[PDB]
Design a protein around this ligand. Structure first.
Ligand SMILES: NC(=O)c1ccc[n+]([C@@H]2O[C@H](COP(=O)([O-])OP(=O)(O)OC[C@H]3O[C@@H](n4cnc5c(N)ncnc54)[C@H](O)[C@@H]3O)[C@@H](O)[C@H]2O)c1
Ligand SMILES: NC(=O)c1ccc[n+]([C@@H]2O[C@H](COP(=O)([O-])OP(=O)(O)OC[C@H]3O[C@@H](n4cnc5c(N)ncnc54)[C@H](O)[C@@H]3O)[C@@H](O)[C@H]2O)c1
Ligand SMILES: NC(=O)c1ccc[n+]([C@@H]2O[C@H](COP(=O)([O-])OP(=O)(O)OC[C@H]3O[C@@H](n4cnc5c(N)ncnc54)[C@H](O)[C@@H]3O)[C@@H](O)[C@H]2O)c1
Ligand SMILES: NC(=O)c1ccc[n+]([C@@H]2O[C@H](COP(=O)([O-])OP(=O)(O)OC[C@H]3O[C@@H](n4cnc5c(N)ncnc54)[C@H](O)[C@@H]3O)[C@@H](O)[C@H]2O)c1
Ligand SMILES: CCNc1nnc(Cn2nc(C)cc2C)s1
Ligand SMILES: CCNc1nnc(Cn2nc(C)cc2C)s1
Ligand SMILES: CCNc1nnc(Cn2nc(C)cc2C)s1
Ligand SMILES: CCNc1nnc(Cn2nc(C)cc2C)s1
Lengths: 268, 263, 268, 263
């Protein structure tokens, strides 16, 4: 009766109970999926958070910037799901851009070392995760990444927008590779969601004007979205990621599904 | 258990067993949906074809160019599904373009009366179907239309491509209206499907319709079987479900990913 | 010294001194072009307007819905420019949508007979003009149409947006045809300009809420446009149309140049 | 009389007589522009090549990865054009992607250190050039970068396509900055050009680079000559002129119209 009954899915990106990945994982488990979770740096925090999910799931360490973590990932994942078992789904819910590349800091003042760390984690890592997990993925499988529509320039998002543009391009290429395994690669372009970092930004953490600009963006989103947009609810986004992990979008790859209330299709 | 369990869906566009709508209806019924089918002109042919679907479904007449058929549609639909029952889903799988606007006929030789009939049936009727069925649709509902990616010009499709461009624009506006009812409006841009309209209605056209399938399969990272409408039908059901709840005025590409690749 | 020195250009769409076509024609003449002007219905009004252009230009009647006017157009144009002379440029600055298809009238209440008149004049006519004038056009030539970005739904524009979406598609096809003559076909997607009809709309002619919605759109345009947007100045749009009529965009066809202050590239 | 009469334009990216920048510079000078040229690494080779341009132009060193070169650029440029003079135009014709990220090497085998060098030179440097030259640019000015349409994935281009996608995003942001100075920022998405970087830097690669030209010419309604950079160079000059005054954060396609057609 579950949308993902008997599916083995890797879910990365859980840091808090407000992370999009926390809701992707919760909905996937509600839908019968058996999960493997990857965490970065704060493994003690991630453990106490992931324990509050509907079901038990092994937690593995994964710094996408660590080439040893990536090289050992498939072996570690196979150990957690059992020899002879493969993944049906992979969720990349990873994004990061240093403070110099987002907020009130002038767009021209982001040092390249920072932008490069940001593009490494936010875009390149999508291809790294794919390279590492495709050898242990089943035909009919699904790789899903989290995107924020970068088609147009926005205030404050700055170099994260640039990283999303790179991620969109990476995805179309990952799909060419994924296809050889009978696996789909897609992105979910979500509307803005109130994660801990996002509430902090809106509160003025990256400067006041950045907070005010994002608040206008969030307000405008809901105004344009024909069915509305509730940034305080990550479940519609999580439900969309599950739809892509399911067998119900079998002919969609190298693509982007917009879980944004339809705001991107409206000007005013 | 099914993806569309206890959902009341209207499905238009069944003419043959090869119609995309025939497969949309078959998959929806396999998925627990209770259907209402609309048909055009050849109602005797349609009833016979639809009797081959997995389950019984009332068949209603609908010429989208007939303003009386549209004006009475909701009342007729309510009669078929029972008073106090509303639709959860609407499938617009309607397209037509006279021969002068699609094929070997030069793009410049399509008379406007023909292009106009084509845009009426292929684009404007998407808004007509919504106007007529939104009053009898439930919050959480879904309106789904069939599209063929018109972003770039292509040989033979000519004015049907122009009509698809109009349909995509109509859809974004239908979504503004649909939203007031808590209903989503979206299109499925399918890869080419060897429906009879495709082969039969649309010289060495045999190798032409074979080559189209082959070229598309190459571009598609996951491939493309022009003889198989089921992946398209599954994508339509995904939009009719509760699993794409924040997607409206949009296009989902059920094309194997061909549109995302240059070669 | 003129961008269009010794070029023979047909310019359609002059109705008032505020028409985009009036400024396209004025800039083209300032740039050395020899013009042929087409007018619709109000030929007495068009004559007294076009007389206030920098130079004399023959005025011909053209109702794009009249198949006789179209069938005789090339012959009439050849008569005005002289036997043995051909056009180097064609400007389609024609658009119309009945009141039922624009404004506060509900989108669902536009009768098809009206939408059809609108798509006939606004989209189909681009291909009609091309069909009629390509036989009398020189290699290196340029067909230019006026567009308003229809990528996203907007309030009030309603069925005119639908017609622009059709026009964009028509253009890509016209370019396939035009190419056989060595002629380019493109559109200029202009930001909103304060023509007589537009000021009337903003004033509340198609209902108050439509006027208010358009005023917000115009305000937002200038806000998003990185170089600003002055709807009261049609010269930047006219200069863009001339750029496409010139030999300086020789490898651009079936395309759209955005003379919108760059507003379409910015979200907020 | 010329399209760029009395305009002071910086032109970067000349390495050979086949470089797009060599033709951009030649056409700009033919059009009355007074140029400042920037070169990377092989300055002896570049000075010799640029001595073949229609007119004398000072050549300055610029490694876009060198923060000292960038920090001193405006001061060095002002010295070459005279105190009290500012730039009206800037041409960024810079691109690089190590072999691991472009060609037969599998997409998954490009080390990040290489992709990062590529994105630094190909995308980030567009913003670096603007940061450095906007303080010495005149209102009405123009910043123009070279792009290759990255909307869809394509064989061999791999991570350079990823870098072009980043460059298009960078451009929209550079335009927000540029706008404060009354300066436009735009990209020219060119069709393929048989520059040496193209043929030489990017087995049966001879028939590969011939077939690319032929396929593109078919798709292009007006055709495409891969051996002719002049139409691209003319499009760059159009953006550097005063004839596209309301276009910024945008892309002009100098590809013969190939991107607007599916076949
Ligand atoms: N929040 C929004 O408004 C929004 C909208 C659209 C898309 N997104 C995207 O959704 C994704 C998830 O982020 P979120 O908004 O849920 O916030 P989040 O902070 O909850 O999650 C981001 C995750 O990235 C992980 N991460 C950072 N560096 C890493 C590394 N080196 N290796 C592995 N993991 C690393 C973090 O540990 C964290 O769990 C990101 O791709 C983000 O860009 C967010
Ligand atoms: N076959 C493909 O390659 C393909 C690809 C993408 C999209 N599509 C679209 O899918 C839809 C169905 O196409 P198909 O291939 O199944 O062909 P089809 O001919 O079987 O279906 C089109 C339907 O439209 C109906 N119709 C025509 N005029 C009508 C009118 N005036 N009133 C009411 N109904 C009318 C026909 O009776 C028919 O049932 C169309 O919208 C088509 O444009 C087809
Ligand atoms: N004003 C804006 O905000 C704006 C923005 C972008 C694009 N446009 C487009 O620019 C074009 C020019 O319109 P405008 O805004 O300058 O207003 P306008 O009223 O000055 O011009 C429209 C022209 O269409 C002509 N026309 C109408 N029906 C015709 C027919 N049957 N045959 C021939 N000509 C016919 C009119 O006579 C008139 O000269 C249109 O395509 C319009 O949609 C306008
Ligand atoms: N040739 C094509 O098919 C094509 C098509 C579209 C766009 N382009 C783009 O046009 C531009 C020029 O390409 P081209 O084909 O003329 O090749 P090219 O190799 O001749 O030019 C690229 C230039 O970048 C310079 N460069 C590289 N690394 C640098 C650095 N660290 N600092 C400063 N300068 C550096 C090189 O010296 C060279 O002058 C590039 O941006 C390229 O991506 C090329
Ligand atoms: C200094 C802040 N750094 C961040 N890096 N990634 C982030 C996650 N994210 N991604 C989008 C898109 C929106 C948000 C908030 S915030
Ligand atoms: C004479 C042409 N008549 C048709 N009208 N609609 C059709 C359905 N259709 N639409 C697309 C797009 C592809 C196919 C097969 S064929
Ligand atoms: C009842 C009003 N009818 C109109 N038909 N064409 C118009 C011209 N136009 N085109 C765009 C785009 C914006 C405007 C004002 S107004
Ligand atoms: C080893 C690869 N190095 C290169 N870096 N930039 C290049 C220029 N370029 N960019 C595109 C796009 C097409 C061409 C020829 S070749």
């Amino acid at each position: 009766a579950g949308l993902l009954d008997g599916k083995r899915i890797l879910v990365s990106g859980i840091i808090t109970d407000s992370s999009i990945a926390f809701h992707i994982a919760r909905v996937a488990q509600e839908q019968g999926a058996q999960l493997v979770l990857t965490g970065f740096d704060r493994l003690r925090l991630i453990q106490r958070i992931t324990d509050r999910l509907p079901a038990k799931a092994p937690l593995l360490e994964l710094d996408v910037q660590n080439e040893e973590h990536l090289a050992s990932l498939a072996g570690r994942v196979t150990e957690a799901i059992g020899a002879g078992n493969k993944l049906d789904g992979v969720v990349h819910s990873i994004g990061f851009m240093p403070q110099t590349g987002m907020g009130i800091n002038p767009f021209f003042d982001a040092p390249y070392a920072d932008v490069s760390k940001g593009i490494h984690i936010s875009a390149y890592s999508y291809a790294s995760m794919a390279k590492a997990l495709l050898p242990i993925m089943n035909p009919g499988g699904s790789i899903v990444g989290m995107d924020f529509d970068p088609s147009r320039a926005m205030p404050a998002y700055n170099w994260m927008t640039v990283a999303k543009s790179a991620l969109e391009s990476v995805n179309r290429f990952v799909a060419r590779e994924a296809g050889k395994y009978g696996v789909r690669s897609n992105l979910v372009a979500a509307g803005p969601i109130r994660t801990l970092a996002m509430s902090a930004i809106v509160g003025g953490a990256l400067g006041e004007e950045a907070g005010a600009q994002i608040q206008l963006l969030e307000e405008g989103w809901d105004q344009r979205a024909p069915i509305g947009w509730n940034m305080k609810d990550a479940t519609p986004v999580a439900k969309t990621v599950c739809a892509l992990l399911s067998d119900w979008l079998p002919a969609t790859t190298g693509d982007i599904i917009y879980a944004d209330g339809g705001a991107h299709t409206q000007l005013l």
